[PDB]
From a paper:
RadD, a member of the SF2 family, is a recently discovered DNA repair protein involved in the repair of DSBs after radiation or chemical damage. RadD is classified into the helicase superfamily (SF) 2, which contains all seven conserved motifs of SF2 and a small homology sequence outside of these motifs. Here, we reported the crystal structures of E. coli RadD/ATPγS and RadD/ATP at 3.0 Å and 2.7 Å, respectively. An ATPγS or ADP molecule was buried between RD1 and RD2.
RadD/ATP crystals were obtained by incubating and co-crystallizing 5 mg/mL RadD and 5 mM ATP with 5 mM Mg2+. The electron density of the structure showed only the density of the ADP molecule and no density of γ-phosphate, indicating that ATP was hydrolyzed into ADP during crystallization. However, in the structure of the RadD/ATP complex, an ADP molecule was at the same position as ATPγS. However, in our structure of RadD/ATP, Ser38 solidly interacted with the Mg2+ ion, Asp117 was away from the Mg2+ ion, and Lys37 was in the middle of Asp117 and γ-phosphate of ATP at a distance of 3.2 Å and 3.5 Å, respectively. The side chain of Lys37 and Asp117 moved away from the γ-phosphate of ATP in the structure of RadD/ATP compared with the apo-RadD. Lys37 is located between the γ-phosphate of ATP and Asp117, which are on the same line and form an equilibrium state by the electrostatic attraction. The side chain of Lys37 shifts away due to the exit of the ADP molecule, and Asp117 will correspondingly move back to its prepolarized attacking water configuration. Crystals of RadD/ATP were obtained by incubating 5 mg/mL RadD and 5 mM ATP for 30 min at 20 °C, and grown under the same conditions as RadD/ATPγS, except that Mg2+ ion was added to the solution (500 mM NaCl, 5 mM MgCl2, 18% (w/v) PEG3350).
Author numbering: 1 to 82, 89 to 125, 127 to 434, 436 to 448, 451 to 578
The structure:
């Protein structure tokens, strides 16, 4: 041809080729922003039979992709506001002129395919036209951000064995992923430099995250306006370094941060991008920047399509990053190669740890001090990465995962997520299954809240809002026993007993108490006598509610509720 592929580019091509020689279904490739997505595009098109349509939502993406294609010495058409195998188009423009797209189309590539579900509405008109004309039309997505915290995952199965999204995902498969780690190790991107000790960080250890997992507009703009005096004190140091840098990208937390920054540095040498802007004004600021007509770009919406020019060489991070994906997306905005760019200066000011390579758990943290931890599935061996708390030594205090995420395929094409359940109910189903996939048969499972309300309107019933438990142990002519006593904030209490002597009794005790009560399900608790259990009571959680029925004379435990989540 006219071009030569790097090894990783040929991997991405062969991955795609193998997927569609076996499957009709959509696939995504995960490529960082400096990878040269045009080299994959051009090899697929050299091999294609139809034409190939390369769609973007953002017209500047359509123009960037058309330019980078023809920079290879190749011809292709473009369809936007104003001949070869490939057509480069925007969603709006192509959904308009569908009559001009009536030939053979074998492959449709969607750049930034994470955008697809951001309503838009014309896209599926395109999809259905192309599929009417081309029933076996193959669709490849490309993206650097498969997962946005708050929107979830763009694919379902990953070819490494994890499951990510539900049956809902737009792409059933992710078939190649190029790690930042590797692109930096082999020099295909600019190596990043995070200043070891920058002077005055913010104190975002006060993290009050919403349920989708994103810190709220209010909580940000307010909650550390207690330090809103340091907002000029830090831009001073940013200007210090920017003395010797071509383009600085600064990421605020809110418009109330980004404006209180855009005024605080030089007077017309900076600009402000956020979703609340034109339009024609963004089309002016994309020409001004990258052409370097100003220096500082301040933004709060990290979607920087157009401003990730190669000349940017310092990323200053003025916001806490909830997921690692947001951190990686932000640093990656400044990692492109430029002739004589030695590194990219990363200024981590907020409470943002040092893991450009962290695994993305893929769900909200929960407790703010939660880190990723890896738990091995006792069924299939797969290495899950759940949220957890780990001690100084790297040892596991808690992990929070509920189900193994590995998957497998037989030789009949039937594909299944592993079904090992770290948290369970009954005899077993997910903590939040409505119907028992299979037992007490397909019956309707009793919702915790209803079970508590039923038990409340019983007289022979006790319902204690458990504030903790205490263990005693003892012995007689049949061996040892362990007695657990649950109690609420007023010392109302109720207890149960477990003989530890016989192997059936040992086994029942692992079944009915250690497995519900352990903080590290899947990692077995090692113990010889009740004394070892007392010794390890920190590895045990206490129930959120206990229900005891009456007969006879004494109170007898019947139900324990863990992992509550619905108030009350
Ligand atoms: N196979 C290749 N042969 C020659 N140059 C390449 C190759 N792959 C990538 N490059 C160069 O590496 C850089 C890739 O950056 P870019 O084209 O901006 O990535 P993307 O378009 O994927 O965002 C470009 O400067 C490009 O010319
Ligand atoms: Mg490219
Ligand atoms: Zn498993």
């Amino acid at each position: 041809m006219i071009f030569t592929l790097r090894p990783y580019q040929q991997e991405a091509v062969d991955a795609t080729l193998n997927h569609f020689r076996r499957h009709k279904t959509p696939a995504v490739i995960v490529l960082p922003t400096g990878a040269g997505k045009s080299l994959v595009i051009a090899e697929l098109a050299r091999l294609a039979r139809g034409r190939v349509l390369v769609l973007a939502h953002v017209k500047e993406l359509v123009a960037q992709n058309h330019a980078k294609y023809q920079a290879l010495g190749l011809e292709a058409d473009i369809f936007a506001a104003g001949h070869g195998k490939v057509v480069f188009g925007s969603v709006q423009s192509v959904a308009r002129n569908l009559d001009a797209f009536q030939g053979e189309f074998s492959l449709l590539i969607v750049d930034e395919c994470h955008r697809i579900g951001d309503d838009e509405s014309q896209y599926q008109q395109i999809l259905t036209h192309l599929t009417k004309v081309n029933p076996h039309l193959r669709l490849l997505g490309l993206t650097a951000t498969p997962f946005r915290l708050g929107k979830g995952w763009i694919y379902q199965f990953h070819y490494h064995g994890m499951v990510r999204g539900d049956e809902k995902a737009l792409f059933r498969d992710c078939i190649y992923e190029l790690p930042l780690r590797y692109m930096i190790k082999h020099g295909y991107l600019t190596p990043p430099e995070r200043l070891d000790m920058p002077v005055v960080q913010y104190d975002f250890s006060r993290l009050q995250a919403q349920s989708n997992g994103l810190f709220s507009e209010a909580d940000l703009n307010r909650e550390l306006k207690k330090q809103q005096r340091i907002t000029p004190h830090i831009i001073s140091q940013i200007m210090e370094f920017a003395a010797t840098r071509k383009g600085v990208m600064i990421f605020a937390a809110t418009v109330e941060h980004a404006k209180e920054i855009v005024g605080l540095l030089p007077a017309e040498d900076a600009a402000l991008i956020t979703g609340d802007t034109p339009g024609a004004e963004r089309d002016v600021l994309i020409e001004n920047f990258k052409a370097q007509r100003f220096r500082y770009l301040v933004n709060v919406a990290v979607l920087t399509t157009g401003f990730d020019a190669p000349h940017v060489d310092l990323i200053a991070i003025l916001r806490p990053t909830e997921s690692v994906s947001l951190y990686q997306q932000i640093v990656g905005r400044g990692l492109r190669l430029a002739p004589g760019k030695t590194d990219c200066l990363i200024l981590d000011y907020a409470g943002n740890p040092h893991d450009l390579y962290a695994p993305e758990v893929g769900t909200p943290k929960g407790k703010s001090d939660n880190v990723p931890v890896q738990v091995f599935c006792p069924a299939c061996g797969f290495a899950n990465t759940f949220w957890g708390k780990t001690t100084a030594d790297g040892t596991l205090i808690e992990h929070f995962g509920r189900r193994c995420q590995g998957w497998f395929e037989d030789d009949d094409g039937h594909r299944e997520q592993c079904d090992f359940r770290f948290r369970f109910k009954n005899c077993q189903c997910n903590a939040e299954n409505d119907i028992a996939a299979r037992r007490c048969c397909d019956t309707v499972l009793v919702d915790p809240d209803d079970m508590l309300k039923a038990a409340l309107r019983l007289k022979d019933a006790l319902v204690l809002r458990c504030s903790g438990m205490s263990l005693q142990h003892g012995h007689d002519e049949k061996g040892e026993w362990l007695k657990i006593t649950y109690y609420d904030e007023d010392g109302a209490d109720v207890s149960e007993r477990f003989r530890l002597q016989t192997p059936a009794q040992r086994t029942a005790f692992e079944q009915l108490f250690i497995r519900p009560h352990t903080r590290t399900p899947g990692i077995p608790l090692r113990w010889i006598t009740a004394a070892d259990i007392l010794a390890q009571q920190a590895l045990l959680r206490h129930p959120d509610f206990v229900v005891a029925r009456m007969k006879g004379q004494y109170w007898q435990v019947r139900e324990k509720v863990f992992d509550y989540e619905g108030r009350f």
